[PDB]
Design a protein around this ligand. Sequence first.
Ligand code: NAP
Ligand code: IMN
Length: 308
Amino acid sequence: QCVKLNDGHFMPVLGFGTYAPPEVPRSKALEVTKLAIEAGFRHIDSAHLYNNEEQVGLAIRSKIADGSVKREDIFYTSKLWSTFHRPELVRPALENSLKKAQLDYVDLYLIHSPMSLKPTDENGKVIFDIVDLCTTWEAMEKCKDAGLAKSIGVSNFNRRQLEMILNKPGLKYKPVCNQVECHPYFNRSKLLDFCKSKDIVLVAYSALGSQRDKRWVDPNSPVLLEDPVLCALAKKHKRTPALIALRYQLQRGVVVLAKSYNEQRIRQNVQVFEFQLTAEDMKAIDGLDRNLHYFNSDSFASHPNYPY
Ligand SMILES: NC(=O)c1ccc[n+]([C@@H]2O[C@H](COP(=O)([O-])OP(=O)(O)OC[C@H]3O[C@@H](n4cnc5c(N)ncnc54)[C@H](OP(=O)(O)O)[C@@H]3O)[C@@H](O)[C@H]2O)c1
Ligand SMILES: COc1ccc2c(c1)c(CC(=O)O)c(C)n2C(=O)c1ccc(Cl)cc1
């Protein structure tokens, strides 16, 4: 149920996505993260940006206190926000996340995105900052050495951006993973091949087609789970299009996140371990790739470090 990371730690291959939009009451993250642990999720994905680390933390603490799980059974990820890339800001950001969650360590700390921000303009484009991410990475390594994070990694990096870290003089720890948008309409095959060649785990987010946030996502973009190929695979397997999309990533060797704030769907998504897709099913899903990143807004697309 886990994969061994390149620093010797283990990451469960199914993770629970904890982001919900601002209109969902903060209290809901506490309820649903408890439900996710009850259903059998052990990898829990959060971030400073999600404004939910207090609630997600309390859910973890509550399920430890009631005997359901031990802390060593949970794999909890947080992430460094883009206004904290200057290296002197990295360990204080991580300490803040640890304080909000009331944890002694995170299992994984990620650079959330390569697009550094000043610690929006009149045009509505984010105000970029120019930071050498190798210096941010050195600060992340110091966080692992201090024991604040068991493992460190990155998110939203392209090949070139990952290479800059991998080729850094005096590198101490490689990133254990690159968490990126990844689903049948944007399957990141070339990037997955590169990550495998460097023993970096690719972690898929928006694997179910994202929450379609108006800020970032064109409403005209076709809806992943209404795709007829996925719908026909779901009917053939007597599963659901979400379970087809999750199973596809596991069979490729990608670790997959799934967000749900619905009790039935949370319980459904752990069924991904209960069935397999055939070679022909996998080829049919591979045929859907159309270079569609749902995140697609003017506000980021002209950032100097935009990864697409
Ligand atoms: N690193 C980054 O830059 C980044 C960016 C985006 C997301 N993430 C992480 O990835 C997590 C997952 O991505 P995401 O939030 O974009 O959502 P997602 O996992 O793609 O899920 C999209 C929608 O699928 C629905 N859903 C879940 N299970 C389903 C099922 N069995 N059947 C039908 N619909 C189902 C959910 O709605 P209901 O809640 O109504 O079930 C959810 O809103 C996020 O929560 C966050 O942890 C990271
Ligand atoms: C589908 O593509 C994305 C990409 C990033 C997303 C989201 C969706 C959502 C919403 C969702 O998950 O559907 C959130 C909240 N994102 C962020 O966390 C985020 C992280 C880094 C940056 Cl620089 C900007 C935004």
